[PDB]
Amino acid sequence: GVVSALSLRERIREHLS
Amino acid sequence: VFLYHIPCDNCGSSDGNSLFSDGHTFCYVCEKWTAMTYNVWNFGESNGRYSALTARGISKETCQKAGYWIAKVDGVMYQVADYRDQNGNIVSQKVRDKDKNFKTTGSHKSDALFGKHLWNGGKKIVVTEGEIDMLTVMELQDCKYPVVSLGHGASAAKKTCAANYEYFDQFEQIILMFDMAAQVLPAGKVRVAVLPCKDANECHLNGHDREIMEQVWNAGPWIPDGVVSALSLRERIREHLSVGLLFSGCTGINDKTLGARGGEVIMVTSGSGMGKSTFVRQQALQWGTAMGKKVGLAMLQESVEETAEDLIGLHNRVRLRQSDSLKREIIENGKFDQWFDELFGNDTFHLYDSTDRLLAKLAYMRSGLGCDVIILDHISIVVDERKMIDNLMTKLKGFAKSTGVVLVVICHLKNPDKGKAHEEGRPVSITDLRGSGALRQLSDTIIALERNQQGDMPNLVLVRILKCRFTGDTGIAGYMEYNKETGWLEPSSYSG
Amino acid sequence: TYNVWNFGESNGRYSALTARGISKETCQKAGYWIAKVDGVMYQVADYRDQNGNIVSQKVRDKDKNFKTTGSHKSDALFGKHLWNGGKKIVVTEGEIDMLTVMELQDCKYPVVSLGHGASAAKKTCAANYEYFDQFEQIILMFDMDEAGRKAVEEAAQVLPAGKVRVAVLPCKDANECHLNGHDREIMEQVWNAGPWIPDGVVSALSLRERIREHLSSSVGLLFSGCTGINDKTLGARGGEVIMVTSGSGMGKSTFVRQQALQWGTAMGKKVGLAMLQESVEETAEDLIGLHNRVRLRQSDSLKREIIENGKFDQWFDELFGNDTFHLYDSTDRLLAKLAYMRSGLGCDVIILDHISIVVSSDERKMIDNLMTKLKGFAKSTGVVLVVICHLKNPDKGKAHEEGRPVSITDLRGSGALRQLSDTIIALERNQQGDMPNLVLVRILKCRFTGDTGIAGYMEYNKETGWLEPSSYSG
Amino acid sequence: DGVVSALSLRERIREHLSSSVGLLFSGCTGINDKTLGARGGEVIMVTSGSGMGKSTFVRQQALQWGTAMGKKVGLAMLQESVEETAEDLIGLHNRVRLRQSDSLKREIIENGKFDQWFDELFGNDTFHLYDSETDRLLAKLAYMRSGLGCDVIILDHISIVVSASGESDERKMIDNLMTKLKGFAKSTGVVLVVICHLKNPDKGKAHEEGRPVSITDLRGSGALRQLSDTIIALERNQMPNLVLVRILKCRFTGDTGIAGYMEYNKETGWLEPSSY
RNA sequence: ACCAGC
Ligand SMILES: Cc1cn([C@H]2C[C@H](O)[C@@H](COP(=O)(O)OP(=O)(O)OP(=O)(O)O)O2)c(=O)[nH]c1=O
Ligand SMILES: Cc1cn([C@H]2C[C@H](O)[C@@H](COP(=O)(O)OP(=O)(O)OP(=O)(O)O)O2)c(=O)[nH]c1=O
Ligand SMILES: [Mg+2]
Ligand SMILES: [Mg+2]
Ligand SMILES: [Zn+2]
């Protein structure tokens, strides 16, 4: 359930899309 | 017992054969001796052989005198051990193989031991937790001294050792070799010795078996629990002497707080929406990537991506969530990953995605990932509303104790009744913490934020220290000015 | 298990007892016989009803094991069928004792035996209350063990009063005194025994020496920092629970630690701490820094300095040379650890801290049971017990930390804390007022002297940590 | 059966009023005017706050009942041990502070006057003490009534005989203990004094500050005022020595309310009658 | 049969 900040490379731009 | 000598018949000697009181004779020359499953396995049916163990080292006579025999049934190899009674009959068996298939056949009692069917009188006794170490002590002592072993392990010592009391009462001194704690035995009698290896088998296989036998005859006292005398604090204090983390954003805080320590509870409060998340986010961003410490956040208000966008827009001194064209421009030119890599190359930040399930995740974050500062936000969803919050604060104080972690907790305030509200600039008191009255009893540092959004300066804030155990300096720390264009609030020099 | 074993089908035979000293006549009269089944000779006892109907067997083997033949009744007494009246009975614990008394009296006095032993004697004596009404004197004859004293104490409660008399024996019970030749000393215990006195009540004249012993004992430990406190407290004696309270972070632990240091380095008293707020190393460094009149943890440069020049051992040996201090490492197990700290180590002062985690269902019954257990532990021990507690939230008015005078009914959690604590001391200071280093001591409750109110004033030092007796006038 | 007709009862009613009445109190006159002394088979319940002197008054009444009348008195002090509750009565007889003076202890050891102080009061067998479950205590009291032959039974500090046992619901245990003690006092016909405590008020002042007590301020249950005969409350303020007595319930008489005023002595320990 | 003696 704990996700580190390194794996948010293709998630922030997916949220902004 | 020996009586006298008779002339032998096999060797034909005169004084070679010896007669005993038991009726048997023995010659020293010719070497001739005269005279679940619920099924106990027969010895001759399952091909019982007294083979000596080779890979660890146990003689054949010890396996004969102990009853630890190898079965060759069904083409595989089993090591059956036998548990007996005081009468001299087989009570139960234990089957062990390479996969450790624990197939305990027969009536396995709750007070089953090993090696008690031969020994009733004596002075010393050695109790072990396994069977290989017990046979190893029998190898070192040539199978002549009283040594027993538990038949259920060191996990259920409160049942096996408690049921057998009069058997251990017959001796003078009881020596334990469990782990390198059962108080049901009488006091002033039980000794516990310490070996420099894992068990006796490692000292046997690594030449330290002398350190077995030096600890048997010279074992140490009981020493029940963690009652620590003052003599045993020579090196722990010297290790503890060989640190306050600096509060970024204002220099007036560190002049009277001297930072935070290992096992330090910091509480952050203000009015309804006065910017607790922004201030704690600024402290997290200035502590994570600028000091080399690993920080674990647990922001429960927003999601993971939204606080990631906050952090990215904060560090680049812009306002990301306040313009759509600014979000659109940074992705069309490839500068988005440049903000990503220079901030997340060190991986000091760890976010949390969303009540006892939280404490295991905090333990997995602290022990596993190895962080130093853990931040919790929005306590209202987690928390009758008096017993739960007190139990939660007690569990977090116990988690922060003896770990070395800085625990930051964001809380709220209650609604006032008379006078002016908190949004107009009311000086907050210490007893305004809602939910309970124990939140100011376990917290070690309490910081309150005060600002007036409808007054003269809607971007001037005040920091108020309410509780400090380290120094004892509480009150107004200073003033800071908030930026409506970059988000970074700066230390000001406003005077009253 | 199966049925009542007949002597014909089990080869019954009445013989004597050489190893215990009983002839065959007594076992012939009673009915304790020997069966030859399955090779091993089994001993077996017979039970009868009031009329004489055989109802139960007790089968015992060669290796001290028990075997019941079926439903063992609660009114089963060994020897009840033979006697139906009399003025003086003797109740024995086991079964060989009754045969021994029959041997030494030539079958004259009505002597019976129990059917349960010392484990369930109260039930079988409550279920046999109607049988003991037709008698005139009852002589209890039990073992000279702790279980025997427990049986003769608790089983003599459901018996009629004025007819119960207890005899004593120098052996375990009467049979070894029969074997050791003490046949004359047991008959005087049958004829003239001691009545049902030692239940727990005492006489008004038997205390005359012991009140003298307490008169020759019980000196109060003088407090430090203020001489106005000792003028209305007169120290702390054995069995004294002292409660300390103030607001949140007002100086409870600092004052208690200073009191502990002044009792340690100046009186030689063995002090046991149970500090649960912080661990062992922090309070150890606080004691070391406070003895040297500095603030040890509040100076990183001083901690770096004193470890280089080697003067840390000069401060360690002067404190922990005699090992007068004994610390604790962090619910019912705490009582056992404090019992081992008192009895096994030999301390005189026991200090706890922050009782709210210890009481962390309904908290009121838990804190009442906890205070009852600590009061019972302080009773009959002779130890000073210092307990630190906190306060609750006031409804209206100002806060407790802002210099508000605190009342005795502000102790949180329950009202049972002030009902058992002897001396309650509250601390008052105002951190937001004029002087945040001037404190006030308030005696809220005092069972011994009875003088309550403001004791004195002390001034706190921000540099050395030693608060001093001031001379302020309110 | 228990169907006793009223006609065959003339001799029992004639002998019932022949035996009793008496055992006057001490300290105040209004207590004797409103309660008319303590009688056999009654339940006297003395209430106060915390450390308000609820034990000193009962020990002073016990001294006046054991000295001036010679009645056999059985005490059950669970607040302190028997080494102290028999010590303070000597100082109360000799008008000094025996426990509160280290200098007088060595003086009565050396001069041997402690032997004379023990002989001048304990020459008779009128004091039966006890030191420390709930089932064996009533057996001790039955032994004191039947075997020892006591007249006044004092049960101090009831709050540790209903809380020291492991029970799910305490109130039914309090009810059972209260009705069994009432049945014991009815069957034996003995003077019985039982000391309890009060609870926390919801607002206002404290009971140690001059709060007027209510009858619903009893802590633990509501059977303490429904199965008792006389309820006596003590109140003072901390004039730190002006204590007043309130009769909250009297089943025999009807006059309740304020009985009077007493003053505490700091040199002798007696409770002198005040004037106000 | 072996080991030790004194
Ligand atoms: C009495 C006093 C203490 N102090 C400082 C020194 C103390 O170490 C610090 C408070 O630490 P503590 O003494 O530990 O406070 P506490 O025991 O009353 O309560 P808690 O631990 O639960 O918070 O306050 C002052 O600055 N001025 C003062 O006058
Ligand atoms: C009544 C009274 C007592 N005192 C003193 C005498 C004693 O030292 C102390 C109270 O005496 P105690 O009778 O021992 O107090 P208590 O019985 O009410 O306490 P608890 O409920 O916990 O058992 O206060 C006064 O100073 N002035 C007074 O008016
Ligand atoms: Mg503290
Ligand atoms: Mg009292
Ligand atoms: Zn031969």
From Swiss-Prot, chain A:
Domain of life: Viruses
Endpoints of the signal sequence: none
Subunit structure: Homohexamer. Assembles as a hexamer onto linear or circular ssDNA in the presence of ATP or dTTP. Present in a mixture of heptamers and hexamers in the absence of DNA. Interacts (via C-terminus) with the viral DNA polymerase that is bound to DNA; this interaction is essential to initiate leading-strand DNA synthesis. The priming complex consists of 2 DNA polymerases and 1 helicase-primase hexamer that assemble on the DNA template. Interacts with the single-stranded DNA-binding protein.
Comment, domains: The N-terminus zinc finger domain is essential for delivering the primed DNA template to the DNA polymerase. The central core domain contains the primase activity. The C-terminus region is responsible for the helicase activity and binds 1 Mg(2+)-dTTP.
Stated family: Belongs to the Teseptimavirus DNA helicase/primase family.
Function, in words: ATP-dependent DNA helicase and primase essential for viral DNA replication and recombination. The helicase moves 5' -> 3' on the lagging strand template, unwinding the DNA duplex ahead of the leading strand polymerase at the replication fork and generating ssDNA for both leading and lagging strand synthesis. ATP or dTTP hydrolysis propels each helicase domain to translocate 2 nt per step sequentially along DNA. Mediates strand transfer when a joint molecule is available and participates in recombinational DNA repair through its role in strand exchange.
Protein name, entry field: DNA helicase/primase
Organism name: Escherichia phage T7 (Bacteriophage T7)
